[PDB]
Amino acid sequence: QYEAGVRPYRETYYDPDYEPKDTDLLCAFRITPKPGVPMEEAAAAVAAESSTGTWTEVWSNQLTDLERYKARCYRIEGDVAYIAYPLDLFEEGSIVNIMSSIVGNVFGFKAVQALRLEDMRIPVAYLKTFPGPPTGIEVERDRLNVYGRPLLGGTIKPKLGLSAKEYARVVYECLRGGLDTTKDDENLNSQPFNRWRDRFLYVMEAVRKAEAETGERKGHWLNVTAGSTEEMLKRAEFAAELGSRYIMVDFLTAGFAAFASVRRRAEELGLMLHCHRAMHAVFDRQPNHGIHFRVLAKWLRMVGGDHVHTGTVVGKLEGDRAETLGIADLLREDYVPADPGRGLFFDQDWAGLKPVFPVASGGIHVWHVPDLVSIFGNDAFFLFGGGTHGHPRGSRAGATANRVAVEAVAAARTEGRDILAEGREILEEAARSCPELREAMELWGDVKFE
Amino acid sequence: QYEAGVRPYRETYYDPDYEPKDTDLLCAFRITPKPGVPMEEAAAAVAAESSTGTWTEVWSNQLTDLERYKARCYRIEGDVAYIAYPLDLFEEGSIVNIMSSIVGNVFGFKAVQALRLEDMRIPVAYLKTFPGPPTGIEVERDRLNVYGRPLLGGTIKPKLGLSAKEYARVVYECLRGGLDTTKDDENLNSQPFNRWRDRFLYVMEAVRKAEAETGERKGHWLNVTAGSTEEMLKRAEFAAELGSRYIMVDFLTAGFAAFASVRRRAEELGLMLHCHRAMHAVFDRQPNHGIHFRVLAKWLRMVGGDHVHTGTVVGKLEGDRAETLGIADLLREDYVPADPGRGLFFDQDWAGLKPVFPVASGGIHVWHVPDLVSIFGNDAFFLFGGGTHGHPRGSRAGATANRVAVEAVAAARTEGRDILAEGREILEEAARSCPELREAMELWGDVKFE
Amino acid sequence: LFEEGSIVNIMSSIVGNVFGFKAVQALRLEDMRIPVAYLKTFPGPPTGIEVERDRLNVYGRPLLGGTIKPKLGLSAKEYARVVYECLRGGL
Ligand SMILES: O=C(O)[C@@](O)(COP(=O)(O)O)[C@H](O)[C@H](O)COP(=O)(O)O
Numbered sequence A, B: 001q002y003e004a005g006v007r008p009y010r011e012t013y014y015d016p017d018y019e020p021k022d023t024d025l026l027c028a029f030r031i032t033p034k035p036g037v038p039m040e041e042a043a044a045a046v047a048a049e050s051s052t053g054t055w056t057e058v059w060s061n062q063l064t065d066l067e068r069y070k071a072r073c074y075r076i077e078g079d080v081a082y083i084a085y086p087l088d089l090f091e092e093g094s095i096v097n098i099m100s101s102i103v104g105n106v107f108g109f110k111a112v113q114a115l116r117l118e119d120m121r122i123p124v125a126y127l128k129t130f131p132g133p134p135t136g137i138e139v140e141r142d143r144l145n146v147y148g149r150p151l152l153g154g155t156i157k158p159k160l161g162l163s164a165k166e167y168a169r170v171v172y173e174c175l176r177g178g179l180d181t182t183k184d185d186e187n188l189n190s191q192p193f194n195r196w197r198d199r200f201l202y203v204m205e206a207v208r209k210a211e212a213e214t215g216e217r218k219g220h221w222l223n224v225t226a227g228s229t230e231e232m233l234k235r236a237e238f239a240a241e242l243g244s245r246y247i248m249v250d251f252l253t254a255g256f257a258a259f260a261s262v263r264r265r266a267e268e269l270g271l272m273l274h275c276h277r278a279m280h281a282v283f284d285r286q287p288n289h290g291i292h293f294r295v296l297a298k299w300l301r302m303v304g305g306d307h308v309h310t311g312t313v314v315g316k317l318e319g320d321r322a323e324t325l326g327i328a329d330l331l332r333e334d335y336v337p338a339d340p341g342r343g344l345f346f347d348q349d350w351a352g353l354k355p356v357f358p359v360a361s362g363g364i365h366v367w368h369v370p371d372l373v374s375i376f377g378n379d380a381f382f383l384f385g386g387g388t389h390g391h392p393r394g395s396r397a398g399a400t401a402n403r404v405a406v407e408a409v410a411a412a413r414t415e416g417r418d419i420l421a422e423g424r425e426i427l428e429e430a431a432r433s434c435p436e437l438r439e440a441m442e443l444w445g446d447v448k449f450e
Numbered sequence C: 001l002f003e004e005g006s007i008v009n010i011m012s013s014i015v016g017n018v019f020g021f022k023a024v025q026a027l028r029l030e031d032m033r034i035p036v037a038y039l040k041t042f043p044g045p046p047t048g049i050e051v052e053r054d055r056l057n058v059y060g061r062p063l064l065g066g067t068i069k070p071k072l073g074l075s076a077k078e079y080a081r082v083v084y085e086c087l088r089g090g091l
């Protein structure tokens, strides 16, 4: 039955009658066809060229049962195509393989001028081949002995240029002042002005000093991001040898294959793994083309990060409130039902994988705390970089202002108060008893991001 | 001199009088500011948040000489911003670090609604920290014993679903019929229907069988892409054990850190490394946002791929001719001068690094050969997947057709003939002696992409 | 011309054979300009002045040292007795 020649993709790969199986992997693509290409043919091309098909009929199609393996577009709602992929198409436990199919080539076809992967339904049968986070929210709270509030953090600034000595000095001032954690900037790895061995040594010394002086458990997210998997693992081992509770990795710039290796070793070493999403905005910013972050967040939890940045909504970087509320649920809950209002196109069963800590960071200061607590609740990290070191009196006073603000708003929420309506009043009440908080509120009162 | 508060980014990070140094890393960004944000401020924000700055002044800025480490926008032409980065900002030999700075966070700022990295000037002093390709064009031509023509390849189809036995049957027919090489699809890793150990074994038996019957050297690009670096290295080692000349990696989905690890091991194993750019169109397609592929090509050559896909221009996937000509030079030449007509914003000295084979693949057939040879010349791989297996008489016949087409056009060019004006005649000439070629021309004569 | 990160290669070229030619009866290498692009292939000191001063907690003065004498002949026990006296005394 081999009939050589080109045929429309929709002949074989558009099936509006197909009923998805619980074992199918489902994708929701927002397709902008080339003018003149019908939506059905465009969605069939995506399905075909992300599973089994190519641009012309091949004699070798007779050597297998394509009906058993082909992906199928089974539903179209406007410019949104739903595609189902049989379980057997994917390599167990490999996000890399998911990407190679779902986003490998289908974004560059002339027939599809724009394409955005909006969401993906990971079947339970496939999730069971992934380990998920190595620590999880509950275990991490026990390790830090911190309950009932968000956790305080902050990126050391300037991003680059500080010696290891001056760098650990800022770390010490922050942790001493009330921050639970501090972190290397995503782009601080090992550079002539600040070599990783020096920084790890100096910083862990500052961590122990602040922990001893405050009586509270502290940590620093030592960035092991490096140019090769071997180098990253070497730095994770040094971090563990020094007694660090945490390491940090840029999981998108380093990449998913190496990220899996680091997550494996982090658990073996007893380290908690903070995951920075550097580069994500290259893929997930534009609504017409790319990969939505909620998909990257799912992949992140599947491989197993202990934290991942989720945006602030109200900070210097872009983030939608509704979509962020849905992403927090994808990271923390056992089961997330579909919700069009939040861009959740599918129900997501997490098959018992551990939850991930959301991390809100980027251009936030005290006045944002009511919003942040309203969005995330207690199970999140709030990071104040400039919002800490930019305090009129320096990092220690800035850390105190942010710690007090967060504890005051978290307490108000637990008391049943409306922290958005009474946000200002909650902060002013705490400011009367805290000069550092007052000075911070005066400094950045006029600083806002739409 | 520390004054707390928010300051304009351009006060420190915009310097239109700065003169770039030969040791500076230079970026060309096409910026779409948030409406109302001046171009100078947007460009300065990109510079500040990709180097040393943040959203508010910090007391710790006094602890280092930011003038020595800060990036600076030194030139703006309309919506293109040129930014210079001092050499000391970057970790030696780490593309991962380059990305963490240059594309880490600056694509997700509210103040910059779209941003595209158009080009990057890698300084010689930083290039000398990278190994480049392990094999290179010249050494590879010696290993295959092929000179004076493009090399023939082809992806096995259907992408997925073939058993290892049937998969190697298609491979043998292609190689027996005239293809120099065949390759696993980017998304074929190890799956229930086709496990990698089986495929590697079956395929290498087919490769040896075709090499003995043809008397020409053959290869198959065995995909080691996997969910972790360790697993990829394990599959590379098995490919070498079997005597394969090649392995293949999806260097963007696997990621740059694991890419470096596989490149290191490939050289140690004596393997040639084909690199598939799966996922590139997610962020190199749209002209308003992302990273142009020419930047990805430079990074690819620095880490050290032996080939990388470059597009076909005339095939099923999008690609501009002028931009592809420049990228081909970037992959193959020792020095590439700037050229506005091709989007080459900077001169690029390659500091003696070995060159990379361009690979043209995707929806091409015999009628495209005149264009392909005209674009790329002899130093390139042309891959015919569907264009081989879709032949009316099967893969071996298709391979003969494509092989005869490429050799006839390559011969015409070496004779001085204008292969674009006489492209059709050159192919009809060969068709009169090659029924396989004639059959292929009739089948796909009416199949064109814009 | 030079292998990255190899002082050994520098010497093999610059001072390998050219000091023993009949045509050049004496030759002295007075200085050498190491270009930045070649320097970036070398790691440099592992500690450095500043880090080392932090490890010893000594600032604002030269540091004191001293070779144990006699050069050779001291037992390990007596050798460490001299060391202790020196360090105890201010070195
Ligand atoms: O480099 C930066 O900008 C930060 O250190 C913030 O510093 P400030 O706290 O001084 O703003 C974080 O990496 C970003 O917030 C990441 O953005 P996201 O969390 O969206 O990935």
Ligand SMILES: O=C(O)[C@@](O)(COP(=O)(O)O)[C@H](O)[C@H](O)COP(=O)(O)O
Pocket (backbone or CB within 6 Å): A049, A054, A055, A105, A108, B155, B157, B185, B186, B277, B278, B309, B310, B311, B312, B316, B317, B359, B360, B361, B362, B363, B364, B383, B384, B385, B386, B387
């Ligand atoms: O998956 C595919 O479509 C291919 O196997 C082509 O199959 P055909 O040869 O049957 O078209 C290649 O991976 C693409 O050409 C890659 O695109 P690029 O080279 O632009 O990365």
Ligand SMILES: [Mg+2]
Pocket (backbone or CB within 6 Å): A155, A184, A185, A186, A187
């Ligand atoms: Mg940062």
Ligand SMILES: [Mg+2]
Pocket (backbone or CB within 6 Å): B155, B184, B185, B186, B187
């Ligand atoms: Mg392919």
